[PDB]
Design a protein around this ligand. Structure first.
Ligand SMILES: OC[C@H]1O[C@@H](O)[C@H](O)[C@@H](O)[C@@H]1O
Ligand code: NA
Length: 378
């Protein structure tokens, strides 16, 4: 039983030339080696095994922006987003459309500027587009070591260490080395911007910042986490998914800066008589879930993917489809992994799973406790 705080429900929002496919495949690979489905579960304990094992649910966010109801729905199903931009093209209209919806729903996010090895790659230009065009406050947490043909890795500005990923094992191991002499002053300039952003978190840190006292790494990360979750800043990372130089550090960022289910506000809906109500992120609350994808499997038949917001659902329970006005009995429950499919007997608040063989459910339907009815969408 994984506690709620170790969950990370995320979406990888990437369009056009950003490299969504390769980024997603690298995520599943690194997580799989450490120890397309509508939602895939994986585990991550950090690039250097420095964290507890977190359970990451990757929700497939539509690569298209043609079906906007689906984009909005995917943003309520995930809790945090990893937005990927192409280092050459930068911010383009399709990612801009999604970013405005993320803002409308208050979705915290981190950014990964991919393709740092491509001709024309310009990291800081993308960063200025985020600030100027998207109207967010990026906080740069890494600088690339070179660009184009000369791209060798990235620098972690909080730790002030260059990261060298081993070529031979496709980036499964790495080493922290000294920042190259020629980049040291620029790294210090950018690190100061991180302290400045973190200082806004509390009066204690503001005092330390104004007086010139040193921040500890834990203080910095605590502040950046809160600021990210409350949509005040957007941490920015960079690298290359294909070259196996970057996604590993982005995964650490998912853990360190993106929300667990308890970090975001309680979901809002209406009862059957139009009264506004909420469902708390708790096992003690009545069950509620939103169905977000209906897929046909050749082996077991239909798979109904849903996000549970509250309560606990067990195989054999009778629930209510509050949109159709019909009771549904839950049979088998599954969770998809990169290369396997795991049978489970219950799904708790904050998790995502697929129900086998349901009859009444279509996308957007709410499944809930028969006695305490809620409609989460329309
Ligand atoms: O230890 C890595 C991270 O784990 C998360 O579950 C905590 O909420 C963070 O404060 C911490 O930085
Ligand atoms: Na959300």
């Amino acid at each position: 039983a994984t506690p709620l705080k170790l969950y990370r429900n995320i979406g990888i929002a990437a369009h056009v030339d950003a490299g969504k496919t390769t980024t997603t495949e690298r995520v599943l690979y690194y997580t799989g080696m450490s120890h397309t489905s509508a939602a895939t579960t994986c585990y991550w304990s950090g690039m250097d095994k420095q964290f507890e094992s977190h359970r990451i649910n990757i929700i497939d966010t539509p690569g298209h922006v043609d079906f906007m109801i689906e984009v909005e729905r995917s943003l309520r199903v995930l809790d945090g987003a990893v937005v990927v931009f192409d280092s050459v093209a930068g911010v383009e209209p399709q990612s801009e459309t999604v970013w405005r919806q993320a803002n409308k729903y208050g979705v915290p996010r981190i950014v990964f500027v991919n393709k740092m090895d491509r001709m024309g790659a310009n990291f800081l230009r993308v960063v200025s587009q985020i600030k100027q065009r998207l109207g967010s406050t990026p906080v740069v947490l890494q600088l690339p070591i070179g660009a184009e043909e000369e791209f060798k890795g990235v620098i972690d500005l909080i730790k002030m260490k260059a990261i060298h990923w081993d070529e031979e094992n496709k980036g499964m191991t790495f080493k922290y080395v000294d920042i190259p002499a020629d980049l040291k002053s620029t790294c210090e300039e950018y690190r100061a911007h991180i302290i400045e952003a973190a200082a806004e978190y509390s009066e204690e840190l503001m005092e330390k910042y104004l007086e010139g006292e040193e921040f500890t790494e834990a203080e910095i990360k605590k502040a950046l986490r809160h600021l990210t979750i409350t949509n005040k800043v957007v941490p920015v990372f960079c690298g290359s998914a294909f070259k196996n130089k970057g996604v590993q550090a982005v995964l650490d960022g998912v853990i360190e800066y993106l929300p667990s289910p308890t970090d975001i506000p309680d979901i809002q809906g209406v009862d059957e008589h139009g009264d506004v109500i909420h469902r708390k992120t708790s096992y003690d609350e009545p069950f509620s879930a939103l169905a977000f994808k209906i897929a046909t499997d050749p082996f077991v038949g239909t798979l109904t993917y849903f996000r549970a917001y509250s309560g606990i659902l067990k195989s054999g329970d009778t629930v209510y489809n509050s949109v159709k006005g019909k009771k549904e009995r839950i049979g088998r429950l599954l969770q998809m992994h990169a290369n396997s499919r795991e049978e489970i007997k219950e799904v708790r608040a904050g998790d995502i799973a697929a129900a086998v063989g349901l009859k009444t459910v279509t996308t957007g339907d709410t499944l809930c406790d028969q006695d305490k009815v809620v409609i989460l969408e329309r």
